[PDB]
């Protein structure tokens, strides 16, 4: 059509590369909105089918859960807009403006989460984190801007050493940080006071999908009565119900002897979730997902 698969992937990659701060889901949603801007269609059925194909292609570009969550959220947005306005011509402008406002809100979501989450860090605390996370970095930046003093432990995140990147980014603002092995989370758990990690996707029951080392970290925190806090944006809410680790879809484990890239953490191992909707219990995610889909 007006935009081809090749230039769709090119736009996605260019938008990701131009602003490295923006997350993959935000870039995918921006690419989908741009695709909707230039569609040259006249039927809401063809628009929905074309958007579904574009989401399939984008998820083929990168195998992150957040991209698929953003795609489903965009599809629900299109369905709601179509429900509101029957005529396609009047519906398209409403979709475009609502998507612009949605982009603005999902851009402000990170700062909202940081402002609502920095208060949970105390003076002289020891914060344990798992790997690189822009939301955790922003939360710690906001905590430091509040004239708070604390130490941070990070894990090296063996498959790709994003923990070292997080440690360097934290040293950039003069934060006492330490780097430990992925096998030293249980050893170092007794030193930490609370745990803050990111999330690539929030599943229906309140659990999270995150990097491969998150589940054992949460279990070790539970075994020592340590609070386990998760910071995650709203556009990462996905209607998935994994019963165990093997139940996670294979399109998210690999391509992102055997080396899975993600794991699932049950809601019972999570104390609170910090989202742009506020501070929530894991039970609120299911309520949000139910309310969204009628």
């Amino acid at each position: 059509g007006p935009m081809d698969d090749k230039e769709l992937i090119e736009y996605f990659k260019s938008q990701m590369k131009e602003d490295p701060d923006m997350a993959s889901a935000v870039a995918a949603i921006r690419t989908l909105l741009e695709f909707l801007k230039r569609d040259k269609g006249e039927t809401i059925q063809g628009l929905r089918a074309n958007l579904t194909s574009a989401i399939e292609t984008l998820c083929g570009v990168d195998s992150s859960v957040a991209v698929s969550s953003g795609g489903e959220l965009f599809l629900r947005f299109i369905s709601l807009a179509s429900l509101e306005y029957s005529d396609y011509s009047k519906c398209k402008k409403i979709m475009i403006e609502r998507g612009e406002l949605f982009l603005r809100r999902i851009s402000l979501s990170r700062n909202k989460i940081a402002d609502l989450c920095h208060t949970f860090i105390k003076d002289g605390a020891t914060i344990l984190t798992h790997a690189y996370s822009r939301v955790v970095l922003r939360v710690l930046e906001a905590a430091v801007a509040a004239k708070k003093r604390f130490s941070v432990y990070v894990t090296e995140s063996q498959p790709d050493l994003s923990g070292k990147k997080m440690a360097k980014a934290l040293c950039h603002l003069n934060v006492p940080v330490t780097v430990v092995l992925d096998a030293a989370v249980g050893y170092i758990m007794e030193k930490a006071d609370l745990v803050i990690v990111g999330a690539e996707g929030v599943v229906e029951n309140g659990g999270i999908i995150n990097k491969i080392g998150t589940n054992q970290m949460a279990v070790c925190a539970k075994a020592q009565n340590k609070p386990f806090y998760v910071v995650a944006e709203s556009f990462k809410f996905v209607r998935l119900f994994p019963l165990n680790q093997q139940d996670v879809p294979d399109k998210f484990k690999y391509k992102a002897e055997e080396h899975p890239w993600v794991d699932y953490t049950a809601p019972s191992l999570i104390t609170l979730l910090f989202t742009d909707l506020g501070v929530l219990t894991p039970s609120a995610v299911s309520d949000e997902l139910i309310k969204l889909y009628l």
Partner: protein
Amino acid sequence: QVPTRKDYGSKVSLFSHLPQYSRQNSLTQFMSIPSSVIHPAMVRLGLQYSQGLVSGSNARCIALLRALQQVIQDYTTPPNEELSRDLVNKLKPYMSFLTQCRPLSASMHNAIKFLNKEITSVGSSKREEEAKSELRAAIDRYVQEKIVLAAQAISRFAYQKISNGDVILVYGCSSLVSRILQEAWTEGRRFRVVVVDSRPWLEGRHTLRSLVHAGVPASYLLIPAASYVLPEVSKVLLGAHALLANGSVMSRVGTAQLALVARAHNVPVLVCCETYKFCERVQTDAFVSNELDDPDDLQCKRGEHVALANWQNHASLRLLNLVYDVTPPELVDLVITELGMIPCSSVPVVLRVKSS
């Protein structure tokens, strides 16, 4: 003979199998003066037992052994009889009277067993004065080895587990705990102590004074606020009235609760106890075997009115004053004895090696 002490007040149904006495009501009011059926030393010892003039387990054991030494000194053998049997048969009513005055502690039971074994081991051909002197020397040696050297060894062992800048939480009054802390401060360790106390005995205050007199920084609070202070606590050190064969710790009521709250806060729990307080019996809860103190001690003057005054007027009202509780072995991290640093599961092992 010796009359039976009358139970005071109405007891809880679950605790109806245990005696419950009144502090004011003494037994010697129904006994002859001078004492004939009971030795005067035992009469005085029971009088201070019932009134609570001596309370610590080590103190009670020491007082009992001193009274037994006095009785043995004043004892004479009857014609056509043996020392070994007559002494035990004469001591049995004294122990019954002491139990009537107040239920015997585990250390007291172990001391009674040791003394009975020593008396039964006295040869028939042995002379009376020689046997009495040997019994007195055996009692003195038992006191020395089982109390003083044991406490010194336990303090030496516990010195290695105390580091500079840590917070130790203690409960109630325990001579072993205070001794350990005093020597730890003396050798050069720098730390602070958190003292936990509970009504109505408020024995912890005693320890507090000791710490104040040793220069050790100290803090004071009641048991319900323990969960508030454990986040800053580095370790919990607890004395024990007895250690049971299954590894559980029988101690002052509130010890098991403190161990549970400490486990909830991820702080280690250490229990210090001499090996002579180890018991072969087992106990799963605080209901089957316990002591009922005077219920009237629970009355407190809050403001200008005492709410529990004349509590026996209400038929359905009951007052429970539990003395002891049981801590399961899973709530205790380390046990410090004169033999060394051992886990709770090693309690029966010691019982195997001390006997033979």
